[PDB]
Design an enzyme around this catalytic site. Structure first.
Site, short mmCIF file in Angstrom:
data_model
loop_
_atom_site.label_atom_id
_atom_site.label_comp_id
_atom_site.label_asym_id
_atom_site.label_seq_id
_atom_site.Cartn_x
_atom_site.Cartn_y
_atom_site.Cartn_z
N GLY A 109 36.64 -3.47 56.60
CA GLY A 109 35.81 -3.91 55.50
C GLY A 109 36.49 -3.75 54.16
N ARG A 110 35.81 -4.23 53.12
CA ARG A 110 36.28 -4.15 51.75
C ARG A 110 35.27 -3.37 50.94
NH1 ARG A 110 37.67 -9.51 53.51
NH2 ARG A 110 39.96 -9.71 53.45
N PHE A 143 36.98 -1.74 45.04
CA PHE A 143 38.41 -1.85 44.74
C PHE A 143 39.22 -1.20 45.85
CE2 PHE A 143 35.92 -1.65 40.80
CZ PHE A 143 36.27 -2.86 40.21
N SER A 144 38.86 -1.51 47.10
CA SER A 144 39.55 -0.97 48.27
C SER A 144 39.43 -1.88 49.49
CB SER A 144 38.99 0.42 48.62
OG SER A 144 37.59 0.38 48.82
N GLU A 145 40.35 -1.69 50.42
CA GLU A 145 40.30 -2.31 51.74
C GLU A 145 40.40 -1.19 52.78
OE1 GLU A 145 43.43 -5.32 52.02
OE2 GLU A 145 41.97 -6.83 51.35
N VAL A 146 39.56 -1.25 53.81
CA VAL A 146 39.53 -0.22 54.84
C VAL A 146 40.06 -0.80 56.14
CG1 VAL A 146 38.13 1.57 55.93
CG2 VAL A 146 37.48 0.67 53.68
N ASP A 166 23.94 11.53 45.53
CA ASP A 166 23.82 10.10 45.84
C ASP A 166 23.34 9.84 47.28
OD1 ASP A 166 24.05 7.37 45.02
OD2 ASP A 166 26.20 7.30 45.51
N1 LIG Z 1 35.11 6.03 58.27
C1 LIG Z 1 34.97 4.69 58.43
N2 LIG Z 1 35.00 4.12 59.66
C2 LIG Z 1 34.87 2.78 59.83
N3 LIG Z 1 34.70 1.92 58.81
C3 LIG Z 1 34.66 2.36 57.52
C4 LIG Z 1 34.79 3.81 57.26
N4 LIG Z 1 34.71 3.96 55.93
C5 LIG Z 1 34.54 2.73 55.38
N5 LIG Z 1 34.51 1.77 56.33
C6 LIG Z 1 34.34 0.30 56.13
O1 LIG Z 1 34.62 -0.07 54.77
C7 LIG Z 1 33.51 -0.77 54.19
C8 LIG Z 1 33.28 -0.39 52.72
O2 LIG Z 1 33.88 0.87 52.39
P1 LIG Z 1 33.06 2.00 51.58
O3 LIG Z 1 34.05 3.02 51.07
O4 LIG Z 1 31.92 2.45 52.46
O5 LIG Z 1 32.43 1.14 50.35
P2 LIG Z 1 32.48 1.54 48.79
O6 LIG Z 1 31.92 2.94 48.62
O7 LIG Z 1 31.87 0.39 48.01
O8 LIG Z 1 34.05 1.58 48.45
P3 LIG Z 1 34.58 1.97 46.97
O9 LIG Z 1 33.87 1.14 45.97
O10 LIG Z 1 36.17 1.68 46.88
S1 LIG Z 1 34.22 3.99 46.62
C9 LIG Z 1 32.31 -0.48 55.08
O11 LIG Z 1 31.41 -1.59 55.13
C10 LIG Z 1 32.92 -0.15 56.43
O12 LIG Z 1 32.95 -1.31 57.28
#
Ligand SMILES: Nc1ncnc2c1ncn2[C@@H]1O[C@H](COP(=O)(O)OP(=O)(O)OP(O)(O)=S)[C@@H](O)[C@H]1O
Length: 288
Positions: free
Chosen positions: A14-15, A18-21, A137
């Site tokens: 996912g995104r 300002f990140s990609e996971v 939060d």
């Molecule tokens: N531990 C994890 N395992 C699997 N997928 C994850 C995990 N952490 C994040 N993701 C994926 O990443 C997507 C978004 O990341 P998040 O960090 O949850 O969003 P966010 O808090 O808006 O990110 P920011 O703005 O950079 S702090 C989610 O919809 C998940 O699909």
């Protein structure tokens, strides 16, 4: 496509903002993990670069030390270039409670209670830890349903707004001064957080108790108890949380009066009348 000499990147999950996971395989530990590659910005320069960096590094140092099965684990940090860095997390399947409630509207009481007990065990741990934490939060977006079900396991995450109740900041009489007033999602914050004056508000782990009350209500009725059809700017304009003095319950669907009594305990307007996390963690409603 491997990072930090271990971290073999498999596919996108996912995104963020300002990140990609990415799902990755950790070659040293021999387990699957989630690598979150933070990418900023090239044209924020100087001022907004470093306070985004220290906000991230602050969260990292809080979250790193947390070890509990109802909290997502955080394994590693490393920088890439000057304008990017990674955090490495426990790989978690499924989606979050916010997504679930979009599909299914509401849930059963047995299911809603199953989630709350798990959240409360995390909060009990955050108030047993080396200087206690307020997870400021708490909301459906930060509750992961890791089995894809409401009756199943959950974990909490996102300590970006979390306050540390250390001895410099906090004492049991006064509590601690609210650090960054206006931050967070206003539906899940209590009345004391919205008072603007000379000195900032005084808070304690009782702000998490309010969050739990709101989240539980939301799971049962599919609507938020205060300011349901209102934006963040509307909430402030109307002071709808400062008017949240009594919580009402729609007649459908049916919830037990024990559940309703639990919600009124959590959503006590005056913080002195509200139970704290310790007392929530031994609430009769939540006893197996
Ligand atoms: N531990 C994890 N395992 C699997 N997928 C994850 C995990 N952490 C994040 N993701 C994926 O990443 C997507 C978004 O990341 P998040 O960090 O949850 O969003 P966010 O808090 O808006 O990110 P920011 O703005 O950079 S702090 C989610 O919809 C998940 O699909």
């Amino acid at each position: 496509p491997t990072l930090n000499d271990r971290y073999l990147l498999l596919h996108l999950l996912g995104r963020g903002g300002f990140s990609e996971v990415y799902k990755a395989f950790d070659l040293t530990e021999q387990r699957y993990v989630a690598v979150k590659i933070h990418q900023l910005n090239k044209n924020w320069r100087d001022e907004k670069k470093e306070n985004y960096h220290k906000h991230a590094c602050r969260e990292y140092r809080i979250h790193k030390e947390l070890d509990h099965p109802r909290i997502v684990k955080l394994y590693d940090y490393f920088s890439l270039d000057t304008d990017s860095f990674c955090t490495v997390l426990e790989y978690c399947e499924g989606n979050d409670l916010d997504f679930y409630l979009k599909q299914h509207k509401l849930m059963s009481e047995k299911e809603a209670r199953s989630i709350i007990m798990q959240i409360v065990n995390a909060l009990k741990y955050l108030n047993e830890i080396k200087p206690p934490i307020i997870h400021y939060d708490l909301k459906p977006g930060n509750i992961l349903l890791v089995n894809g079900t409401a009756c199943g396991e959950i974990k909490i995450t996102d300590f970006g707004l979390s306050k540390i109740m250390d001895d410099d900041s906090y004492n049991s009489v006064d509590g601690m001064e609210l650090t960054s007033q206006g931050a967070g999602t206003y539906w899940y914050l209590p009345p004391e957080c919205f008072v603007v004056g000379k000195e900032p508000p005084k808070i304690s782990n009782k702000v998490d108790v309010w969050s739990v009350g709101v989240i539980f209500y939301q799971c049962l009725y599919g609507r938020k108890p205060f300011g349901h059809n209102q934006s963040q700017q509307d909430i402030l304009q109307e002071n709808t949380i400062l008017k949240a003095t009594e919580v009402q319950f729609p007649p459908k669907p049916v919830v037990t009066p024990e559940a309703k009594a639990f919600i009124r305990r959590c959503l006590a307007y005056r913080k002195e009348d509200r139970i704290d996390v310790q007392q929530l963690a031994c609430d009769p409603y939540l006893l197996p």
